[PDB]
Design a protein around this ligand. Structure first.
Ligand SMILES: Cc1ncc(COP(=O)(O)O)c(CN[C@@H](CO)C(=O)O)c1O
Ligand SMILES: Cc1ncc(COP(=O)(O)O)c(CN[C@@H](CO)C(=O)O)c1O
Lengths: 397, 397
């Protein structure tokens, strides 16, 4: 039947369970003490696989904003933005985004996935081109799939290939080059400056996904593009509320004068319920605090450097040579090594993300650590001690 | 450039504004007094365009559940379900769905749109078939677009055409027939009994979208399918949290023994953040209350019948001959008539949904009323008085 095509995934999952590891896709934060600590499997566990980069989920202003919205506006909105839909807090979150990015335009979506699905499938139609980095987020690929544009992949972080690939395309059709500031797999940074210059040489518009930089890149927290001096040169910036902001939702911001017209054509914007009052109140409050969250940001980068530097010192192979983001990827030799390492850490009271094929390429097996501005120096050293103990026990280092 | 393709929509929107009507896609609930009353444009306005069928958004248990979750678990989850992701309240909402639908299987998504996008694109692959009603929700069409199955449309609520269309397909490939219990455009009901019997004759699996029936159809509130005696015959039921439940989120439930394997393949499930603790706590609490919400349900249907019956009595042409759902669609002769009627009601203190081409077919212009179990008989008569005053002032009736 229709589910028979899953027999292979069901077998592979059971074969992983046969190894004796905890089901990695069924971990439950039974209790959450803080942005960095939760009770998992009855054990107090340090969290190092969240993308809660700025620890805003327990910020007292954020929580109070959320509680106030539930009291004032209820548990939900009344369907689509384009119908009953739009509450006061939705107009506020959009303005919070404008103020944060210094843009005239801001369209919020009900998820980050849907923002990418939507903006990509809506901006580029038949006969037009979407040119994307080969390791773009799944939501970017799905957006290409939802659209009817021609899709053009280029080699990962290759300025050369972007240029050659763009150059071969016909000049007249409109083009969208899709980049990410920080790429989530290895925690590496795009050379946006060079890629944007290449994009503009060929007359292409540029979309940058800054989900993994919001709040802690650039002088205003706007992302890698702002860090690299590209203010006013990026046509569209996409992001999410689910990383630094600390809730759900997606968005695209832009200074294009027609940008608000996307609301009129964008199906994942039109045909879904708007976010609950509490979600947009917490996002609004968090976003605004993120404009001037210097202490958090400093601690985030201090934590990232300590984890990255310490893990490299012990002899772990990392995804990046230098500490370029709040993601640190530990690269392991085989899938078994990853699992035992992952289980060891979990059992010792640390949760990190495990990444394996097909999540990664066939020749790559990762443990992905995501640093939080609310990790303490003590926690970071405890994690280092834990990686040292696990790596040595498993024979990785 | 990429936005030039919107010039036509920008012109049409401005041409509507030239008429002198309020921008219908920018209405803001500045304040919300209750499920049925809000301050819009500085005026106390009755809400009749929400899909808040059961008035759960201000249920005290729902709100308290939401507040407790913000306090205990924070403003957000830690990314994808398949990673840090899953909190206690996510396991609870899924079980609440199982208990509500009497199913072993329940997969929650971050939106209803994404549940449809995801389940349809994931269940039917290359060489397989998706057979859908021609007026299926936009999210169902988009799911077909996201997949690589063959798409087969049949004439709206035509059991005959479904049968002929299915019959022509090759017998061996797996097939998904997609139906809705209540169709949102006219508020009409599908003949699921006959369509399911046809679907099963051709060996097809059936997906039913019961977004517009949850809580008030069937002896358990499960939807039109339960109302029509189809318990245990529907392979998958899709729904949303954004209508009766009173927040955001989507879901699919099923008794298929492999159903949980969809989590392993479903991209819009894998590659998006899980819902915030407050969202899943409010959904959980609402869903459970909806199992035994008889007073609300009785009032909902009593309200629907009064509005439907009263509007028909005055001489309005309605989408349905009898009161078949909580949606009442008033059919108008031309787009101007719809607008002036819509503006008149708004100005008199009533918001209803306006539907026009291309939202509707070229030969259809609708005002769509959605009834709420928390409307009072007094409000319903006030609305009737308002439709009477507007219709007569505009010359509709
Ligand atoms: C039958 C059906 N199935 C699925 C969905 C998607 O639900 P979501 O809005 O919760 O994503 C809707 C949405 N319907 C509303 C928005 O909530 C709309 O204006 O389109 C629907 O009507
Ligand atoms: C670069 C990028 N762009 C967009 C998204 C989508 O954001 P959403 O999870 O808020 O929908 C993600 C999600 N990333 C996480 C889930 O939040 C994941 O595990 O895939 C992302 O990494």
């Amino acid at each position: 039947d229709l589910l028979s095509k899953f027999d292979g995934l069901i077998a592979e999952r059971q074969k992983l369970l046969d190894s004796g590891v905890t089901d990695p896709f069924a971990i439950v934060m039974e209790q959450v003490k803080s942005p960095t600590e939760a009770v998992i499997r009855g054990k107090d566990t340090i969290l190092l696989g969240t993308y809660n980069y700025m620890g805003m989920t327990f910020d007292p202003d954020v929580i109070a904003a959320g509680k106030e919205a539930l009291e004032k506006f209820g548990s939900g909105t009344y369907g689509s933005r384009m119908l009953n839909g739009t509450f006061h807090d939705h107009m506020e979150v959009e303005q919070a985004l404008r103020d944060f990015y210094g843009t005239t335009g801001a369209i919020v979506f009900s998820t980050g996935y849907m923002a990418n699905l939507g903006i990509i499938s809506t901006l580029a139609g038949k006969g037009e081109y979407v040119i994307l980095d080969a390791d773009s987020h799944a939501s970017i690929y799905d957006g290409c799939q939802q659209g009817n544009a021609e899709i053009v992949r280029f080699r990962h972080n290759s300025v050369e290939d972007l240029d050659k690939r763009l150059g071969r395309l016909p000049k007249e059709p409109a083009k969208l080059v899709v980049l990410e500031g920080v790429y989530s797999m290895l925690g590496d940074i795009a050379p946006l400056k060079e890629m944007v210059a290449v994009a503009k040489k060929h007359g292409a518009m540029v979309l940058v996904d800054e989900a993994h930089s919001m709040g802690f890149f650039g002088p205003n927290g706007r992302g890698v593009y702002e860090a690299q001096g590209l203010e006013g040169q990026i046509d569209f910036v996409v992001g999410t509320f689910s990383k630094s902001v600390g809730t759900v939702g997606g968005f695209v911001v832009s200074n294009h004068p027609k940008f608000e017209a996307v609301r009129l054509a964008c199906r994942p914007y039109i045909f879904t319920a708007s976010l609950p009052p509490s979600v947009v109140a917490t996002a609004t409050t968090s976003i605004r605090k993120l404009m001037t969250a210097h202490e958090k940001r400093e601690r985030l980068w201090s934590n990232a450097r300590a984890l990255h530097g310490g893990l490299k010192a012990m002899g772990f192979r990392l995804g990046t040579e230098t500490c370029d983001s709040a993601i640190v990827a530990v690269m392991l030799e085989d899938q078994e090594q990853a699992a035992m390492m992952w289980q060891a850490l979990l059992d010792g009271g640390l949760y990190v993300n495990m990444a394996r094929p097909p999540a990664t390429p066939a020749g790559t097996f990762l443990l992905r650590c995501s640093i939080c501005a609310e990790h303490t120096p003590a926690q970071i050293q405890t994690v280092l001690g834990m990686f040292q103990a696990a790596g040595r026990a498993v024979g990785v280092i």
